[PDB]
Copies of this chain bind each other. A is one copy, B any other.
């Protein structure tokens, strides 16, 4: 039974490896430092981003999809399960154009009439780099995976953003969905590793209800992550955002690398500030 290769006979294979074997790919936008401790997002890697409900996850991720899909011309696949395509389409446009397009009826009215809409649409979806999952109607694990599968190998997406991994909708008849979040994870990491696609997954936090928490600051710990630490093991990197909406600097958010397989370099990456005007998470200078 021989499948036992001696290191000597791997010379070429290894050489072929070192050349065009990327260790730095897809850098995050909005806070160098995330990049310092992670060296970006490698293909085949599963990237986890979390935070207190409504503190940065969504915006942050949505911004990465934007930069990757624009300035760096990558094919971005979007799977925003809790919202409609036009809705997320709307967010991107406003965001790209640094305007709270949704939070303003006046503006939506304007651009549609003065014609700026069409301008903005082509200026963003012009190079056909964005592709989304359409439905809203509960997607099943394999059902979903099949579609992400299509996005990767079919439309050739470089990145897939799955927003919210609690919306499972699968094989109902097996206690505690904990097993679900885990099996799903396994299928995601497996899907990622083999296709080589960068996979950014969002998940929520357990409600600590034992101290003072999240919405009020309080660092998020690897244990806090929803779903029984199956993702704490299946995901290669873990970005967490922390901020105190009920404090002094509600828009000051701290980025913490809870985990990073590739580099092993963990800890506080840096900070960012939410600009209510532009609706962006701008880079910041701070230290507490």
Given contacts A103-B262, A246-B267, contact A215 B209 (CB under 8 A): no
For the complex, what is the distance from the CA of A136 to the CA of B234, rounded to whole Å?
A: 8
Within 8 A of B (CB), among A2-31: 2-8, 10-11, 13-19, 21-24
Number of copies: 6
Interface bits A92-120 vs B (CB < 8 Å: 1, else 0) = 11000000011111101101100001100
Are the C-beta atoms of A14 and B137 separated by less than 8 Å? no
| B2, B15, B204: the one within 8 Å of A221 (CB) | B204
| B87, B134, B229: the one within 8 Å of A207 (CB) | B229
- Nearest-CB distance from A238 to chain B (Å)? 10
- Nearest-CB distance from A193 to chain B (Å)? 9
Q: Which residues of B contact A169 (CB under 8 A)?
A: 228
Are the C-beta atoms of A223 and B219 separated by less than 8 Å? no
Interface bits A163-195 vs B (CB < 8 Å: 1, else 0) = 000110100100010100010001000000000
Are the C-beta atoms of A221 and B53 separated by less than 8 Å? yes
Q: Which residues of B contact A265 (CB under 8 A)?
A: 103, 250, 276
Are the C-beta atoms of A222 and B229 separated by less than 8 Å? no
Are the C-beta atoms of B182 and A204 separated by less than 8 Å? no
For the complex, what is the distance from the CA of A95 to the CA of B280, rounded to whole Å?
A: 41
- Nearest-CB distance from A84 to chain B (Å)? 7
| B19, B209, B261: the one within 8 Å of A228 (CB) | B209
Q: Which residues of B contact A86 (CB under 8 A)?
A: 10, 13-14, 16-17
| B1, B56, B208, B229: the one within 8 Å of A264 (CB) | B56
By beta carbon, the residue of chain B nearest A37 is: B250
For the complex, what is the distance from the CA of A194 to the CA of B71, rounded to whole Å?
A: 37
Are the C-beta atoms of B131 and A5 separated by less than 8 Å? yes
Any chain B CB within 8 A of the CB of A74?
no
6 A-B pairs closest in CB distance: A7-B130, A207-B229, A245-B266, A17-B86, A7-B125, A1-B146
Q: Told that A4-B151, A172-B178, A246-B256 touch, could you supply 20 new A-B pairs with CB distance under 8 A?
A: A3-B135, A4-B132, A4-B155, A7-B92, A7-B128, A13-B89, A16-B86, A53-B232, A53-B258, A103-B263, A167-B229, A207-B218, A207-B223, A209-B217, A209-B218, A215-B222, A216-B223, A246-B258, A264-B274, A265-B276
User: Which residues of A are interface residues toward B (Cβ below 8 A)?
Assistant: 1-8, 10-11, 13-19, 21-24, 39, 53-56, 59, 77, 82-87, 89-90, 92-93, 101-106, 108-109, 111-112, 117-118, 121, 124-126, 128-138, 143, 146-147, 150-151, 154-155, 166-167, 169, 172, 176, 178, 182, 186, 204, 207-209, 211-213, 215-219, 221-223, 226, 228-230, 232-234, 245-247, 250, 256, 258-268, 274, 276, 287
